[PDB]
From Swiss-Prot:
Full protein name: Suppressor of tumorigenicity 14 protein
Disulphide connectivity of cysteines: 39-55, 174-188, 199-228
Glycan-modified residues: 170
Highest taxon of source: Eukaryota
Subcellular location(s) of the protein: Membrane
Taxonomic path: Eukaryota, Metazoa, Chordata, Craniata, Vertebrata
Catalytic residues, chain numbering: 54 (charge relay system), 109 (charge relay system), 203 (charge relay system)
Amino acid sequence: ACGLRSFTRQAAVVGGTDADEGEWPWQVSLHALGQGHICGASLISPNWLVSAAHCYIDDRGFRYSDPTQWTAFLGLHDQSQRSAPGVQERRLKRIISHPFFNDFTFDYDIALLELEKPAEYSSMVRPICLPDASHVFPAGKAIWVTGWGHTQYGGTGALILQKGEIRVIQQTTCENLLPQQITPRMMCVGFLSGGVDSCQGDAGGPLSSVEADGRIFQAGVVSWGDGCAQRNKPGVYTRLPLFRDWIKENTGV
């Protein structure tokens, strides 16, 4: 029962960037309290979220690694409507960053978050499917990027959740075009639709990919907020399939 939306009503049925209510029920808004929306994540069970490890590194005097300073908003659609019927608010109980995560190269940039109380599944709150470690997202496959991200010049993000597409491209392309290190845990992508870039994610937000079955699987996790794709350069995102056993061993999922 993972990844099957409810697509309440219709509203947008011919395109657009604004997401519809209930169209991404696994998208989570993470607030470091006193600052509002800071990161994204994805629901995989009543108790566990997937996010990015670099969201939880202490900067300034604020301890982003401290779980007690975080609140997860699930089923949230408009960041000025935190109060709204489907919204669920949960405190964080534990953060499990990946043991091999490197704060400089953002390699192995994935984290597991435990809710203090279970989420309640609804029309607006539903889990996404996790791919097996052998699940392949081939070059050219379209994947959805969603969030409340800033512009690359930052640049307030939109109040209404935004959606856009990217496509998988060859790993060699990002190797020969970007100066940063591209590791096997990262996927190379190009812009597909939107949007003038894929910067609507969110760091720790999910990459949603509609599979042949029709259930939506999470192909990856957003790393750098401005590692987003655009007309002249590709973007890099964190893969998820090679982490499946590690997620399940740590969560039961």
